[PDB]
Recover the amino acids of this structure.
């Protein structure tokens, strides 16, 4: 009820961020020849290099579709196929960003930062910090809970 | 202070990741995809017009028109815009009984885990956090509203 309304507000809030994001980024994506979700993959890999398998369940959806979008990015040359080994090799391919992929990620960050900043310039810095602290522990708990299924 | 943006993006994906994990079985059985659940979930918050939904989910307009038409083909949603709120371009879309049962299960699953993670939490600490995010949601909506 209580917690049920908080959960409902968090869904609306995330959905609203997604909706603003998509609209602010439609032009940039269009410039690079990619869709919103291909763009998502690029945001995940700007965090770290990954393999199709690692990004599939960590977004949790049908295996093939993700494979498709990684193939589309490779041919758009926004991403690369590497083997920077120093850890038990089985069979697998490491996917990381090309330098055009990082250029996009920086165009995207600058657009998100200006808008986030503008909408937040009247806020009290210590108030935002306290809020982040609370979401940091929620993030932490979500993460550890997920690791246990 | 823009490491702030990075953290929110990551917090959003962790949320989404866990939700895809918890609802895999539920969404499969109802014949749903994750993006359609979001439309459904949204419609449980309020009865909406498509023009409304397009601006509130706003990506390609035709791609979201498709997702609502599929929810109607599946009868997960009802097209009920009688003369109270209507005569305003398009319709008033709302969940049907089947759709209503899906979101009940969805809430059953999420409520228990959220509650499990927040049990040591001070109501007031969470309320204040909610207040601040309400301002930011307000602004995001206001900003989304224009260009």
């Amino acid at each position: 009820r209580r917690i049920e309304d908080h959960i409902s507000f968090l869904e609306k809030f995330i959905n609203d961020v997604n909706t603003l994001t998509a609209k602010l980024l439609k032009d940039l994506q269009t410039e690079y020849g990619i869709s919103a979700e291909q763009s998502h993959v690029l945001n995940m890999l700007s965090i770290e290099a990954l393999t199709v398998g690692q990004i599939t369940e960590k977004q949790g959806v049908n295996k093939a579709a993700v494979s498709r979008r990684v193939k589309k990015l490779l041919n758009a040359e926004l991403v690369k196929l590497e083997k920077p080994d120093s850890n038990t090799d089985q069979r697998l391919k490491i996917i990381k960003l090309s330098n055009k992929g990082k250029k996009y990620i920086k165009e995207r960050k600058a657009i998100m930062s200006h808008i986030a900043s503008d909408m937040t310039s009247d806020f009290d810095s210590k108030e935002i910090e306290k809020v982040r602290q609370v979401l940091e522990i929620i993030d932490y708990r979500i993460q550890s809970y997920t690791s246990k299924l």
Remarks:
- Strands of chain A lie at 79-82, 94-97.
- The domain at 1-149 of chain A is CATH 1.10.10.10 (Arc Repressor Mutant, subunit A).
- Chain A touches chain B through 54 residues (CB under 8 Å).
- Chain A has six helices and two strands.
